[PDB]
């Protein structure tokens, strides 16, 4: 379990609400990844290969990626608490 | 930048941040952390407010479920998740900044 506090937070919640939260969390993650991808694609080549780093544009991409990773950690936790990955149409 | 607490008990909670921030100018890692600090404070305020707005039956645990409850939970999830991020940035910096 990546984010332990979610155990206690979701304690007692009806299983349909847990599933619902988890499905919405899948949708959010995918939206976050698409955003992080978009910003990455717009970076100059040099930042893409790691030759250069820093500056506002690169920081914005980094921030988008952090949000994506933080979310994924939550999502993985939700899977452990739910007991499954729900079927979601992509 | 201004330091709040030195020699932190580093918990690297979100591994990918290390590679993300590798090589940044120190000023840029500090700008990231500061904005993460401000973000976290914000998320806490929102989750705490949503909690206080719940009907007293939900706060006591006499009731659960439904859209309002879910909304509090999701806000809370976002707060915990962002705090995992922030604790990792503190590990990378080696200190907690004052903001």
UniProtKB/Swiss-Prot annotation, chain B:
Domain of life of the organism encoding this protein: Bacteria
Example of a GO biological process term: negative regulation of DNA-templated transcription
Matching SUPFAM superfamilies: Transcriptional repressor TraM
Alphabetized UniProt keyword annotations: Conjugation, Plasmid, Repressor, Transcription, Transcription regulation
Pfam families for the chain: Prok-TraM (PF09228)
Annotated S-S bridges: none
InterPro entries, per the entry: Tscrpt_rep_TraM (IPR015309), Tscrpt_rep_TraM_sf (IPR036336)
Function: Negatively regulates conjugation and the expression of tra genes by antagonizing TraR/AAI-dependent activation. TraM may either bind or modify TraR or AAI making them unavailable. Alternatively, TraM may bind tra promoters preventing TraR activation.
Name of the featured protein: Transcriptional repressor TraM
Lineage: Bacteria, Pseudomonadati, Pseudomonadota, Alphaproteobacteria, Hyphomicrobiales
């Amino acid at each position: 379990v990546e984010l332990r506090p979610l155990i206690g937070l979701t304690r007692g919640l009806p299983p349909t609400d847990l599933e619902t939260i988890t499905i919405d969390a899948i949708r959010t993650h995918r939206r976050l990844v698409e955003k992080a991808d978009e910003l990455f694609q717009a970076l100059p080549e040099t930042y893409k290969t790691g030759q250069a780093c820093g500056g506002p544009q690169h920081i914005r991409y980094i921030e988008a990626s952090i949000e994506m990773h933080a979310q994924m950690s939550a999502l993985n936790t939700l899977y452990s608490i739910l007991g499954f990955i729900p079927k979601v149409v992509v």
